[PDB]
Amino acid sequence: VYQIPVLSPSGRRELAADLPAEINPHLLWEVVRWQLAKRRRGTASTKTRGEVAYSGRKIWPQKHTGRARHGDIGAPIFVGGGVVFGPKPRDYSYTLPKKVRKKGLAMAVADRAREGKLLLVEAFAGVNGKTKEFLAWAKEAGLDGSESVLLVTGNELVRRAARNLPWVVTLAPEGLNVYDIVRTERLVMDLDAWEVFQNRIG
Amino acid sequence: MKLSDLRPNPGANKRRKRVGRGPGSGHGKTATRGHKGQKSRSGGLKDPRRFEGGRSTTLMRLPKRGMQGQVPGEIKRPRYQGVNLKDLARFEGEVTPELLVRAGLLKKGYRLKILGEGEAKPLKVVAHAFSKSALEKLKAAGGEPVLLE
Amino acid sequence: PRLKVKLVKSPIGYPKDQKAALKALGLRRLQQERVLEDTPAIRGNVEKVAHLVRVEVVE
Amino acid sequence: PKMKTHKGAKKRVKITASGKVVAMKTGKRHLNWQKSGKEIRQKGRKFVLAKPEAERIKLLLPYE
RNA sequence: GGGCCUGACUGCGAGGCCUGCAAGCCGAGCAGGGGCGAAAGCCGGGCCUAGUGAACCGGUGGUCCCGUGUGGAAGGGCCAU
RNA sequence: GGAUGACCCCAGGCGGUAGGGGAGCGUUCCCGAUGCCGAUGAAGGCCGACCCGCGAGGGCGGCUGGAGGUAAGGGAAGUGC
RNA sequence: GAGGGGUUGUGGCGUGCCUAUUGAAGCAUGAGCCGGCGACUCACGGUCGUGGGCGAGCUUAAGCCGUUGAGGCGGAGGCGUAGGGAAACCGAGUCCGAACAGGGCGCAGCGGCCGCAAAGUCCGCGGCCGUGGACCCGAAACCGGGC
RNA sequence: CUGUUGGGAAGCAGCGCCAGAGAGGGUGAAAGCCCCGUAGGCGAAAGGUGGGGGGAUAGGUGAGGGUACCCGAGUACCCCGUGGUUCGUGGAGCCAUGGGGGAAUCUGGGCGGACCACCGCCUAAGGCUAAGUACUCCGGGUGACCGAUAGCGCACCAGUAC
RNA sequence: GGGGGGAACCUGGGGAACUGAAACAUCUCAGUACCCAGAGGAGAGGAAAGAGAAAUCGACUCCCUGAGUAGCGGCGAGCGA
Ligand SMILES: [Mg+2]
Ligand SMILES: [Mg+2]
Ligand SMILES: [Mg+2]
Ligand SMILES: [Mg+2]
Ligand SMILES: [Mg+2]
Ligand SMILES: [Mg+2]
Ligand SMILES: [Mg+2]
Ligand SMILES: [Mg+2]
Ligand SMILES: [Mg+2]
Ligand SMILES: [Mg+2]
Ligand SMILES: [Mg+2]
Ligand SMILES: [Mg+2]
Ligand SMILES: [Mg+2]
Ligand SMILES: [Mg+2]
Ligand SMILES: [Mg+2]
Ligand SMILES: [Mg+2]
Ligand SMILES: [Mg+2]
Ligand SMILES: [Mg+2]
Ligand SMILES: [Mg+2]
Ligand SMILES: [Mg+2]
Ligand SMILES: [Mg+2]
Ligand SMILES: [Mg+2]
Ligand SMILES: [Mg+2]
Ligand SMILES: [Mg+2]
Ligand SMILES: [Mg+2]
Ligand SMILES: [Mg+2]
Ligand SMILES: [Mg+2]
Ligand SMILES: [Mg+2]
Ligand SMILES: [Mg+2]
Ligand SMILES: [Mg+2]
Ligand SMILES: [Mg+2]
Ligand SMILES: [Mg+2]
Ligand SMILES: [Mg+2]
Ligand SMILES: [Mg+2]
Ligand SMILES: [Mg+2]
Ligand SMILES: [Mg+2]
Ligand SMILES: [Mg+2]
Ligand SMILES: [Mg+2]
Ligand SMILES: [Mg+2]
Ligand SMILES: [Mg+2]
Ligand SMILES: [Mg+2]
Ligand SMILES: [Mg+2]
Ligand SMILES: [Mg+2]
Ligand SMILES: [Mg+2]
Ligand SMILES: [Mg+2]
Ligand SMILES: [Mg+2]
Ligand SMILES: [Mg+2]
Ligand SMILES: [Mg+2]
Ligand SMILES: [Mg+2]
Ligand SMILES: [Mg+2]
Ligand SMILES: [Mg+2]
Ligand SMILES: [Mg+2]
Ligand SMILES: [Mg+2]
Ligand SMILES: [Mg+2]
Ligand SMILES: [Mg+2]
Ligand SMILES: [Mg+2]
Ligand SMILES: [Mg+2]
Ligand SMILES: [Mg+2]
Ligand SMILES: [Mg+2]
Ligand SMILES: [Mg+2]
Ligand SMILES: [Mg+2]
Ligand SMILES: [Mg+2]
Ligand SMILES: [Mg+2]
Ligand SMILES: [Mg+2]
Ligand SMILES: [Mg+2]
Ligand SMILES: [Mg+2]
Ligand SMILES: [Mg+2]
Ligand SMILES: [Mg+2]
Ligand SMILES: [Mg+2]
Ligand SMILES: [Mg+2]
Ligand SMILES: [Mg+2]
Ligand SMILES: [Mg+2]
Ligand SMILES: [Mg+2]
Ligand SMILES: [Mg+2]
Ligand SMILES: [Mg+2]
Ligand SMILES: [Mg+2]
Ligand SMILES: [Mg+2]
Ligand SMILES: [Mg+2]
Ligand SMILES: [Mg+2]
Ligand SMILES: [Mg+2]
Ligand SMILES: [Mg+2]
Ligand SMILES: [Mg+2]
Ligand SMILES: [Mg+2]
Ligand SMILES: [Mg+2]
Ligand SMILES: [Mg+2]
Ligand SMILES: [Mg+2]
Ligand SMILES: [Mg+2]
Ligand SMILES: [Mg+2]
Ligand SMILES: [Mg+2]
Ligand SMILES: [Mg+2]
Ligand SMILES: [Mg+2]
Ligand SMILES: [Mg+2]
Ligand SMILES: [Mg+2]
Ligand SMILES: [Mg+2]
Ligand SMILES: [Mg+2]
Ligand SMILES: [Mg+2]
Ligand SMILES: [Mg+2]
Ligand SMILES: [Mg+2]
Ligand SMILES: [Mg+2]
Ligand SMILES: [Mg+2]
Ligand SMILES: [Mg+2]
Ligand SMILES: [Mg+2]
Ligand SMILES: [Mg+2]
Ligand SMILES: [Mg+2]
Ligand SMILES: [Mg+2]
Ligand SMILES: [Mg+2]
Ligand SMILES: [Mg+2]
Ligand SMILES: [Mg+2]
Ligand SMILES: [Mg+2]
Ligand SMILES: [Mg+2]
Ligand SMILES: [Mg+2]
Ligand SMILES: [Mg+2]
Ligand SMILES: [Mg+2]
Ligand SMILES: [Mg+2]
Ligand SMILES: [Mg+2]
Ligand SMILES: [Mg+2]
Ligand SMILES: [Mg+2]
Ligand SMILES: [Mg+2]
Ligand SMILES: [Mg+2]
Ligand SMILES: [Mg+2]
Ligand SMILES: [Mg+2]
Ligand SMILES: [Mg+2]
Ligand SMILES: [Mg+2]
Ligand SMILES: [Mg+2]
Ligand SMILES: [Mg+2]
Ligand SMILES: [Mg+2]
Ligand SMILES: [Mg+2]
Ligand SMILES: [Mg+2]
Ligand SMILES: [Mg+2]
Ligand SMILES: [Mg+2]
Ligand SMILES: [Mg+2]
Ligand SMILES: [Mg+2]
Ligand SMILES: [Mg+2]
Ligand SMILES: [Mg+2]
Ligand SMILES: [Mg+2]
Ligand SMILES: [Mg+2]
Ligand SMILES: [Mg+2]
Ligand SMILES: [Mg+2]
Ligand SMILES: [Mg+2]
Ligand SMILES: [Mg+2]
Ligand SMILES: [Mg+2]
Ligand SMILES: [Mg+2]
Ligand SMILES: [Mg+2]
Ligand SMILES: [Mg+2]
Ligand SMILES: [Mg+2]
Ligand SMILES: [Mg+2]
Ligand SMILES: [Mg+2]
Ligand SMILES: [Mg+2]
Ligand SMILES: [Mg+2]
Ligand SMILES: [Mg+2]
Ligand SMILES: [Mg+2]
Ligand SMILES: [Mg+2]
Ligand SMILES: [Mg+2]
Ligand SMILES: [Mg+2]
Ligand SMILES: [Mg+2]
Ligand SMILES: [Mg+2]
Ligand SMILES: [Mg+2]
Ligand SMILES: [Mg+2]
Ligand SMILES: [Mg+2]
Ligand SMILES: [Mg+2]
Ligand SMILES: [Mg+2]
Ligand SMILES: [Mg+2]
Ligand SMILES: [Mg+2]
Ligand SMILES: [Mg+2]
Ligand SMILES: [Mg+2]
Ligand SMILES: [Mg+2]
Ligand SMILES: [Mg+2]
Ligand SMILES: [Mg+2]
Ligand SMILES: [Mg+2]
Ligand SMILES: [Mg+2]
Ligand SMILES: [Mg+2]
Ligand SMILES: [Mg+2]
Ligand SMILES: [Mg+2]
Ligand SMILES: [Mg+2]
Ligand SMILES: [Mg+2]
Ligand SMILES: [Mg+2]
Ligand SMILES: [Mg+2]
Ligand SMILES: [Mg+2]
Ligand SMILES: [Mg+2]
Ligand SMILES: [Mg+2]
Ligand SMILES: [Mg+2]
Ligand SMILES: [Mg+2]
Ligand SMILES: [Mg+2]
Ligand SMILES: [Mg+2]
Ligand SMILES: [Mg+2]
Ligand SMILES: [Mg+2]
Ligand SMILES: [Mg+2]
Ligand SMILES: [Mg+2]
Ligand SMILES: [Mg+2]
Ligand SMILES: [Mg+2]
Ligand SMILES: [Mg+2]
Ligand SMILES: [Mg+2]
Ligand SMILES: [Mg+2]
Ligand SMILES: [Mg+2]
Ligand SMILES: [Mg+2]
Ligand SMILES: [Mg+2]
Ligand SMILES: [Mg+2]
Ligand SMILES: [Mg+2]
Ligand SMILES: [Mg+2]
Ligand SMILES: [Mg+2]
Ligand SMILES: [Mg+2]
Ligand SMILES: [Mg+2]
Ligand SMILES: [Mg+2]
Ligand SMILES: [Mg+2]
Ligand SMILES: [Mg+2]
Ligand SMILES: [Mg+2]
Ligand SMILES: [Mg+2]
Ligand SMILES: [Mg+2]
Ligand SMILES: [Mg+2]
Ligand SMILES: [Mg+2]
Ligand SMILES: [Mg+2]
Ligand SMILES: [Mg+2]
Ligand SMILES: [Mg+2]
Ligand SMILES: [Mg+2]
Ligand SMILES: [Mg+2]
Ligand SMILES: [Mg+2]
Ligand SMILES: [Mg+2]
Ligand SMILES: [Mg+2]
Ligand SMILES: [Mg+2]
Ligand SMILES: [Mg+2]
Ligand SMILES: [Mg+2]
Ligand SMILES: [Mg+2]
Ligand SMILES: [Mg+2]
Ligand SMILES: [Mg+2]
Ligand SMILES: [Mg+2]
Ligand SMILES: [Mg+2]
Ligand SMILES: [Mg+2]
Ligand SMILES: [Mg+2]
Ligand SMILES: [Mg+2]
Ligand SMILES: [Mg+2]
Ligand SMILES: [Mg+2]
Ligand SMILES: [Mg+2]
Ligand SMILES: [Mg+2]
Ligand SMILES: [Mg+2]
Ligand SMILES: [Mg+2]
Ligand SMILES: [Mg+2]
Ligand SMILES: [Mg+2]
Ligand SMILES: [Mg+2]
Ligand SMILES: [Mg+2]
Ligand SMILES: [Mg+2]
Ligand SMILES: [Mg+2]
In strand F, which positions have an atom below 7 A from any protein CB?
18-24, 30-32, 34, 71-80
In the sheet that holds D21-24, the strands lie side by side as D14-15, D21-24, D46-48
Per CB-CB distance under 8 Å, the chain B contacts of A28 are 1, 6
Contacting residues for B102 by C-beta, under 8 A, at least 6 apart: none
A49 and A76 Cβ atoms separated by less than 8 Å = yes
Long-range own/partner contacts, residues B45-48 (CB < 8 A, 24 or more apart): B48/D56
How large is the C-alpha radius of gyration of chain B?
Answer: 29
CA angle A99, A100, A102 (to 5 degrees): 65
Q: Where on the phi/psi map is residue A11: left (φ > 0), alpha (ψ -120 to 50), or beta?
A: left
Max distance between CA atoms of chain B, in angstroms, equals 77
Residue B16 contacts A where some CB pair is shorter than 8 Å: no
Resolution reading in Å: 2.6
Q: Cβ(A74)–Cβ(A54) under 8 Å? A: yes
Method of elucidation: X-ray
In B61-83, which positions are buried (b, 16+ CB within 10 angstroms) versus exposed (e)?
A: ebeeeeeeeeeeeeeeeeeebbb
Q: Best interface-test mutation with B: which of D57, D58, D61 has the largest number of B CBs within 10 A?
A: D57
Query: Inter-chain contact B58–D53, Cβ cutoff 8 Å?
Result: yes
Domain of residue C31, residue span: 1-59
Pairing between strand B144-147 and B111-115?
unpaired
Give the Cα separation of B18 and A130 in Å (integer): 56
For residue D34, CA distances in Å to A162, D39, D40, D44 come to 97, 10, 10, 16
The CATH number of residue C57's host domain is: 3.30.1390.20
- Chain-centroid distance of CA A81 in Å reads 39
CB A15 within 8 A of CB A4: yes
Q: What is the DSSP string of chain B?
A: --GGG--PPTTSSPPP---SS-STTS--TTTT--SSSTTTSTT-S--TTT--TTSPPTTTTSPP-S----TT-------EEEEEHHHHTT--SEE-HHHHHHHTSSPTT-EEEEE-SS---S-EEEES-B-HHHHHHHTTTT-EEEE--
Q: How far is CA B51 from CA B115, D10, D12, D56, D58, in A?
A: 44, 17, 17, 10, 14
Q: How many domains does chain C have?
A: 1
D30-42 CB burial, b ≥16 within 10 A, e <16? eeeeeeeeeeeee
Q: Is the CB of D8 under 7 A from strand E?
A: no
